[PDB]
Structure formats: C-alpha cells, structure tokens
C-alpha cells in the first residue's frame, strides 16, 4: 500500500580521489533529502522539473524492460541486464568491462561520510577514472530551501511487511544516448546495497552521457516520483509487457498539472486551484480500482436556553492543554514584562485619583487587589484569554457622578454599590440566559474604527495633558528657592525636573523606534536578532532605569505603593459591608430604584467588552482558536458584581492594553502576520505580578515615573496602525496620483472617499465635543446611534456597491 | 494528444510574459526566439497528482516559486 | 553640571561663572529637536504626501525652516540662558 523508494548516485569523496555510491534521498509518501552535514531535511512534497519529465518519457519509450527475473543478488541482475543491453543493441560490447565495475561498488549510507568528509558529483570516463564535468552545473532547488530521530520515524511509518525499490543513476561520457533498465524480481529479496532490513522487488538503472537540458539528479527524482504513485505501482504489480507500462505512463501524464512562471505570485488567486486538482485526482481515480482516502459562529441565535454559554465552553475549553503548553517561548516572557507595567501604571493612577477624589473611600490597594483577582479568574476560566481587564475612564466618571449624587442627597455611597452589583448580576444572568449577544452582529466596522481611533486619540491627549501639567508645575525660571522640603512632595518649582523628564521620555520613545526597526532589519544572525527585537521595550526600560540611577543630585518623581494590604480610609470602612446598613439603615425606595445606575453600568461594560472583542478578533489577525462572547460577559459582569458586594470596584475589558497584548504575542512573517500565540499563562502572570507589586517597594521606588511616558507614547503609536479611518485620513492629503491599490480606491472615485472620510471625521468631532461637554455620560448611547445611520440614512446618499467596497466587514474579501 | 483550445491557451500564457515579449520586440531570427522559449520553460514547476491535503500542498510551493522567480530575472 | 543647589548672585556679563540650572538640558533638547526636524523634512522631501511642486518646495527648505523654527523657540523663552553667537564689532 505504501512503499519505500531509494536513489543512489556515483560520486567522489573529499578524503581521497575515488568513485563510490552514495544515496541522495528517500521516499515514504514524501521526499526527504540531506545536505553536506549528513542530516535529513524535514519531509516535503516532491517537485519535478521540465527536462526531467521530458527525458523520462523519451527514454521510457525506448527502455528495456525485464519482468519477473529469477535472481538472488545485484551481481546476477547486473550481468543479465548488461546482456540485455547487448541483446537489444543499446550499448557496445567493448563497454561492458567498465560498466560492470561502474555498477559493483560499495553502497554506503550517511553515517560513514563524516569520517569520509563529504562527496561531490563526478563523471565516469572511458579509462575508469573519475573526472569533473565540462558543462556547467547549477545549484539544486530543494537543498537550499529545505535543508537551509528521522530514521526512527521512517521505520515507524513503514509497515513491517513491505518491499522497497531502488534507482541507480550515473553519468558516463563514453556512451551515445541515455539508457534505462527496469527490472521487477520474481520474489522479494534482501540486497546489501540497502542497509535497511526491508527487501527489494523493483529496480531502476538510469545511465547516460552528458547532454544539455539533462540533470541526472532530477532524473532520479522524477523516477522516484513515478514510483511513488499508487495506481502506477498497482499496474507494475500486474504489468505483463511494455505497452502496459506505456499506457500507465500516458495515464499518469494525462492527469498531470503544469503551471508556468508568472509575474507576481499570490496565494489568494491560487486557492481557487483546489477543485481542478481534485478533479485530476478523480480523473486519476477514474481509472483505478483503488480509491483515495479523503474525498461555527461565536454569536448565533439558538433555540435552547443558555445555548451560547455551552457553545463557547465546548468550543474553547478543549484547548486548555495547548493554552498551557504554548507559553514556553521567550516572547511570552517579554509580553508579560511589558503588559505588567502597561497594566500597573493606570491602576496606580486611577487608584490615587479616586482616593483623592472620593475622600479615600476607594484607593490604590483595593484597585490592585481587584485587578489581580479579576485578571487571575478571567485568565483561568475565560473563553478569550487575550483580553486585558482593568479600570477605564467612564467608570471613573460614573464613580464621580455617583459620589456627587450621594453627597448631595445625604445617603451612603459604598452600600448602594452593593445593590448596584446585585442588579448587575441579575441583569447579566438574564441576558446570558436569553443569548442576547447576537446584537453584536449589527455593530459594523464603522463603529469599531470610530471607537478605536477615538480611544487612541484620548490616550495620546491625556498623556500630553499630563506632561503639560508636569511642565506647568515646575516652570523654567531664572531663580529658585532651595530651602524647600521635598519629603512629602516637591514644594515650589524645581530647576531641572521638567526638562530632564522631557529628555528621558523622548529618549525612551526614540530607543523604542530604533529597536522596533532593528527587529525587522538584516544586521545580526536571525535567532539573536529576533530575540533582541522581541525584548526591545524591557531592554530600553532597564537602560533608562540605570541612566536615572547613575544621576544623583537631580530629583525625579518615583513610584510609590501603599505599605500593606490595608483599606484606604479605616475610619469609616471595613473589609465587609453590611447590605442592610453600615452605620445607619438603608432606605427601601433607593433599594428599589438602584436598578437605574445598574442599567447604565451594564450598558457601558457590555458595549466596551463587545467592541473590544470585535476589534481584537477580526479575521485578519490569524486567530486560530475560537473566541466566546457569552462566557466572557458572564464571568466579567458576575465577578464585578460580587466584588461590588465586598466594597471593591467593578472592572471592564480594556482596549489599548488588550490590543497591545495581542500585538506583543504575534510572530510575524517577512510584513505578514505569520501567527499569534494564544495562551492563558500570560494573563495569570500579569495578574499575579500586579497583585504582588505591593511587596516590591525597594525595587520600584527607584524607577522614575517619566520612563512609563515613553511606553505610553509607544503604545499610542502602535495602536494606531490597523485603523482604516486613519489610512483614509492619510489618503486625504496625498494627491489622487498616489492612492494605493486597495479595492475601495479603484472602484469608486476619489472625491467620494474624501466625502466618506469627511463624514466620519465629522462624527469623530461631534463625539469628542460631546465628550468635552458636561453631559459626558451620554457618550456611549450616541456611539451606537451611528449604527442606524449606516443602516438607513447612508443608503440614501451612496450606492450599494460603494457601500460594500468602502465599508467592508472583512479586509481581504470585499 | 492535441487540443487546439489548450494549445492556444499555452500560446497565450506564453505571450502574457514580460521578458519574453521584450525578446519578441528584440527578435530578429528564429534561434534567439527558441533560446528565449527554452529559458522560459527552464523556470516552471510541475505538480504531480498527490493525495496530500490540497491547500497545504499548494501553500508549500510558495517560497520555491519565490526563489524560481528570483532566479529567472537574472 | 547637574547639582542639587546653585548660586544665583553670579555675574554673567563676560561669561557664565559657576553652574547653571537649565542650560545643559535646554541645549540637549534643542540639538535633538533640530536634528529630528531635519531628518523628518529630509524624509518628507522624498515622500508622496503633497502636490509635487509644493512638496519639493517645502522639502528643499528643510534646514532653514528647522533652524528658524528652533531659534524662534529659543527666542520665546525669556529667563533661561543659552549660549549665543558673537562676532567682532568691526573690520
């Protein structure tokens, strides 16, 4: 059923001038070849060459065929075949004495060659001495690409009851034309040319003089690929004459497929060549008695209760062992080290801001514990472990509004949040029960691009505003006071803080760009180059931390964390909050009206998580394993509610952190997204590190706060790449002569793309101005209102083909 | 072993190449034309009937095609 | 150098005596900014972002534009000291 084919050539050794037989490749359903090292490349499909096929047919039309000869060893078959070549006048009788020697030499395998030193091709002469070829030679195609343990796998694949075939190729200048012999033995025989214990039944001999357009290595490869086919082997099992072999040759060539060289090769147009090849297989199996072997939506409405949860569980959870195992690369370590700081910094910022904002009801330690636990649990039991959960801006705005409202009306604050969490839990249970996540289908690419671009813009704006505040706090003056106490905080302006901070940020950002570009360069060996390029951000961070450590007298703000796992304000708060009343009892009417803020929090969390899952999991970013919607929503919202029970805050999925994580765990091809490492270890490690960050005071207290600004700028620049509105804005400036070759440029005129981009920019501007307006909590609602705009109003202005080409949901398919 | 439609298709696939049509503009005798056709046929790859997965077999050829097309332009 | 305290009854008519608070870092930022602006304009000259005439006109004046912008930036700062160019009075 499956056979082994071997090919040996006549070459010379680097040790001493001589001639001997060396194998060159092996065939079990695939081609395996070795280079000068003596190591076998990974098996692959065999690719033939034009002259090889032409000359195999030409010599096979005039080939001597001996069927079922009664012999026992190579010497006898050699004698009989040379008598046959004399018989049909294929060669002169004065040649036999050399030819006999030519086919009687030691057939040794790879293991001696390292002691031998290596081989090179040589040519037989009439004298009997090896010689170098006169016509020039070219490098073989398969050895640089494929070559630049295995025999145990060869013998495991080979069934114990099998027979092998051999082909013996060589060049001899004292011949007229190439000759071919094909002999099938009477019974299976073991021969001393093959060191493997398998016996041999069929045997090839391909000899000839030197001629243009003939490469004897390719000719042997062609013979092996002839021998490998199932039906031709079956015919040889039943062959009785030569014309039968001719008909099988014709049958093989007829169902062959030839492709010419082209101008610009591509995979997408090539994937349409699958069915015709199948039809050739069918046409091949048209003639045969034998037969060939081989001949979901994450969101969907199902007619069962709780269907989506079971769907996501069954789709994702079988991947747990792979999620555990895929984390052994160092890129995972680099991504962990990156996302640790990327998630730690906003946690500290929001904790300090909320502590100084709400009279220390909520602070840094609670936020750290919450991020740690909600990262650990979500990474352990989640459906999409590439999301990064953390505090956001709208949650802080809602906390501000709720604190102001409870301050005004005179009721408590931390107690009502418990009922808000309970209502949140009930609402998320009700929605997941009725699989109400299929509405995510209506959110098109429009809203995704608007949201992501706006988020990146707000990120950059807040970073620059923070810097301008820092510069405003320590201005550039002519004289300063120097009896200032800086134990709690620097009082008054300082000489060199603002400018050293600016220099340090620019240096980190600049270093990030050079390492990002060096990763893609061709300057070092590939392994060390990629290893250095994957750890660019941590290397720059360490360099800059050392640079700040060497400077002694200049002051720079450092990182500071709370002393222990203690509550922020221990005067009015406890570890557990009594729902009925903390100090005074809770009213009934607010218990019943607490559903209203819960609905808004649910809308915010749901929208953010679903848009993040849409942006992260687009079809273009090579995500193999499935992603779940109901399971992640249920986990996140339920854990947020139970944490709101304990007085701890609720969290949501973060956009920039998750996209940065996904981009960090991506191995790209020469650029092409080669693959993306999806695992659950990264999220667990980042969550554990953010949780334990409070125990690393001496190490963190020496890292200046300005180092993280370079990472923030790098994050803002990196997250802006995939945006398509950003590309259309770049296209807003180029003249219509330089627009790219994407379909939405070619199918529609330019001043229509500009109109589309202008409409989208107007939407951006209205969203931003509304964000600046004190009616900021109405920002999400307006956002979803862009979906009806695309569904009803836009088809009143544009045309359907324009709408399909411009607002395409998939990038490759339009 | 003759199909005139496929023979014309082969002629058209010949005529669709850049360098060969450049040689056709610079052609002055039959020998250079045959030599250029030899050079064109020297840089093609044929795929035999294999029972392998068709997408994986077709995608394994791509860097081979890249090297062949780099070799032809020399 | 970068110190923790400086003296501020220093007479600077001929030349800065003693260290100064913000000179070294303003000098470094200004040099890096000028270099960065020069490189971006050199790369924009060869880009395809504006109409060819205006693009080439803007790209050919990269060095003088960056120098004028940078020097004006130094001119806006009043209290900080930066070393200047000085030429003889007459022939």
From Swiss-Prot, chain B:
Give the span(s) annotated as Dimerization arm. 30-74
- What does the annotation say about its assembly with partners? A dimer in solution, but in its membrane environment, it exists primarily as a mixture of dimers and tetramers and spans the membrane asymmetrically. Component of the ankyrin-1 complex in the erythrocyte, composed of ANK1, RHCE, RHAG, SLC4A1, EPB42, GYPA, GYPB and AQP1. Interacts with STOM; this interaction positively regulates SLC4A1 activity. Interacts with GYPA; a GYPA monomer is bound at each end of the SLC4A1 dimer forming a heterotetramer. Three SLC4A1 dimers (Band 3-I, Band 3-II and Band 3-III) participates in the ankyrin-1 complex. (Microbial infection) Interacts (via N-terminus) with P.falciparum (isolate K1) aldolase FBPA; the interaction inhibits FBPA catalytic activity.
Q: Which organism is it from?
A: Homo sapiens
Q: Where in the cell is it found?
A: Cell membrane; Basolateral cell membrane
Task: Cite the source lineage.
Answer: Eukaryota, Metazoa, Chordata, Craniata, Vertebrata
From what superkingdom does this record's organism come?
Answer: Eukaryota
- Family membership noted in the UniProt record: Belongs to the anion exchanger (TC 2.A.31) family.
Q: Report the protein name in the record.
A: Band 3 anion transport protein
Q: What's the disease link here?
A: Ovalocytosis, Southeast Asian: An autosomal dominant hematologic disorder characterized by ovalocytic erythrocytes that are rigid and exhibit reduced expression of many erythrocyte antigens. Clinical manifestations include mild hemolysis, intermittent jaundice and gallstones. However, the disorder is most often asymptomatic.
Functional note: Functions both as a transporter that mediates electroneutral anion exchange across the cell membrane and as a structural protein. Component of the ankyrin-1 complex of the erythrocyte membrane; required for normal flexibility and stability of the erythrocyte membrane and for normal erythrocyte shape via the interactions of its cytoplasmic domain with cytoskeletal proteins, glycolytic enzymes, and hemoglobin. Functions as a transporter that mediates the 1:1 exchange of inorganic anions across the erythrocyte membrane. (Microbial infection) Acts as a receptor for P.falciparum (isolate 3D7) MSP9 and thus, facilitates merozoite invasion of erythrocytes. Acts as a receptor for P.falciparum (isolate 3D7) MSP1 and thus, facilitates merozoite invasion of erythrocytes.
């Amino acid at each position: 059923h499956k056979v082994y084919v071997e090919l040996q050539e006549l070459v010379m050794d680097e040790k001493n001038q001589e001639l001997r037989w060396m194998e060159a490749a092996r065939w079990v359903q695939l081609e395996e070849n070795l280079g000068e090292n003596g190591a076998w490349g990974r098996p692959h499909l065999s690719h033939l060459t034009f002259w090889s096929l032409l000359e195999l047919r030409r010599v096979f039309t005039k080939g001597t065929v001996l069927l079922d000869l009664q012999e026992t060893s190579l010497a006898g078959v050699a004698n009989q075949l040379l008598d046959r070549f004399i018989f049909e006048d294929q060669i002169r009788p004065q040649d036999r004495e050399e030819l006999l020697r030519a086919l009687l030499l030691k057939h040794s395998h790879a293991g001696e060659l390292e002691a031998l030193g290596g081989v090179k091709p040589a040519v037989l002469t009439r004298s009997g001495d090896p010689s170098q070829p006169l016509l020039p030679q070219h490098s073989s195609l398969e050895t640089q690409l494929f070559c630049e343990h295995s025999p145990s796998g060869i013998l495991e694949k080979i069934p114990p009851d099998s027979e092998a075939t051999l082909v013996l190729v060589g060049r001899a200048d004292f011949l007229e034309q190439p000759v071919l012999g094909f002999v099938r033995l009477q019974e299976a025989a073991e021969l001393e040319a093959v060191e493997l214990p398998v016996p041999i039944r069929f045997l090839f001999v391909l000899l000839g003089p030197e001629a243009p357009h003939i490469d004897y290595t390719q000719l042997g490869r062609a013979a092996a690929t002839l021998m490998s086919e199932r039906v031709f082997r079956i015919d040889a099992y039943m062959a009785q004459s030569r014309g039968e072999l001719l008909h099988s040759l014709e049958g093989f060539l007829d169902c062959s497929l030839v492709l010419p060289p082209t101008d610009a090769p591509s995979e997408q147009a090539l994937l349409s060549l699958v069915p015709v090849q199948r039809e050739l297989l069918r046409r091949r199996y048209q003639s045969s008695p034998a037969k060939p072997d081989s001949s979901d939506d994450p969101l969907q409405q199902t007619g069962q209760l709780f269907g989506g949860l079971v769907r996501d569980i069954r789709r994702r959870y079988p991947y747990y062992l792979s999620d555990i195992t895929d984390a052994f690369s160092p890129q995972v370590l680099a991504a962990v080290i990156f996302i640790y700081f990327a998630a730690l910094s906003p946690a500290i910022t929001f904790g300090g801001l909320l502590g100084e904002k709400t009279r220390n009801q909520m602070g840094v330690s609670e936020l750290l514990i919450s991020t740690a636990v909600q990262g650990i649990l979500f990474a352990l039991l989640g459906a999409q472990p590439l999301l990064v959960v953390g505090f956001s801006g709208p949650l802080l705005v809602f906390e501000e509004a709720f604190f102001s409202f409870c301050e005004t009306n005179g009721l408590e604050y931390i107690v009502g949040r418990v009922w808000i969490g309970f209502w949140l839990i009930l609402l998320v249970v009700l929605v997941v029960a009725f699989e109400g996540s299929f509405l995510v289908r209506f959110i098109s690419r429009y809203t995704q691009e608007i949201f992501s671009f706006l988020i990146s813009l707000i990120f950059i704006y807040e970073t620059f505003s923070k810097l301008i505040k820092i510069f405003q706090d320590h201005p550039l003056q002519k004289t300063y006071n120097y009896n200032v106490l800086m134990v709690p905080k620097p009082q008054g302006p300082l000489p060199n803080t603002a400018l050293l901070s600016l220099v340090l940020m620019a240096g980190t950002f600049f270093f990030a760009m050079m390492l990002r570009k060096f990763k893609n360069s061709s300057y070092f060996p590939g392994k060390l180059r990629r290893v250095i390029g994957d750890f660019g951000v941590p290397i720059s961070i360490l360099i800059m931390v050392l640079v700040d450590f060497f400077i002694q007298d200049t002051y720079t703000q450092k990182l500071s964390v709370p002393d222990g796992f203690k509550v922020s304000n221990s005067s009015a708060r406890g570890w557990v909050i009594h729902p009925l009343g903390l100090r005074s009892e809770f009213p009934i009417w607010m218990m019943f009206a607490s559903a209203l803020p819960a609905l808004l929090v649910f809308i915010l969390i749901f929208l953010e998580s679903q848009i993040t899952t849409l942006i992260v999991s687009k079809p273009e970013r090579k995500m193999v394993k499935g992603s779940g919607f109901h399971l992640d929503l249920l986990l996140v919202v339920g854990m947020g509610g139970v944490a709101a029970l304990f007085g701890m805050p609720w969290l949501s999925a973060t956009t920039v952190r998750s996209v940065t994580h996904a981009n960090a765990l991506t191995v790209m091809g020469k650029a092409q997204i080669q693959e993306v490492k999806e695992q659950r270890i990264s999220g667990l490690l980042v969550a554990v590190l953010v949780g334990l960050s409070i125990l690393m005071e001496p190490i963190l207290s020496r890292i200046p706060l300005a180092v993280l600004f370079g990472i923030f700028l790098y994050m803002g620049v990196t997250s802006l790449s995939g945006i398509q509105l950003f590309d259309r804005i770049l296209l807003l400036f180029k003249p219509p002569k330089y627009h790219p070759d994407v379909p939405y440029v070619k199918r529609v005129k330019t001043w229509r793309m500009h109109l589309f981009t202008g409409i989208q920019i107007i939407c951006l501007a209205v969203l931003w101005v509304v964000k600046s307006t004190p009616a900021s909590l109405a920002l999400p609602f307006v956002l979803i209102l862009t979906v009806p705009l695309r569904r009803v109003l836009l088809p009143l202005i544009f045309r359907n083909v324009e709408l399909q080409c411009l607002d395409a949901d998939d990038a490759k398919a339009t």
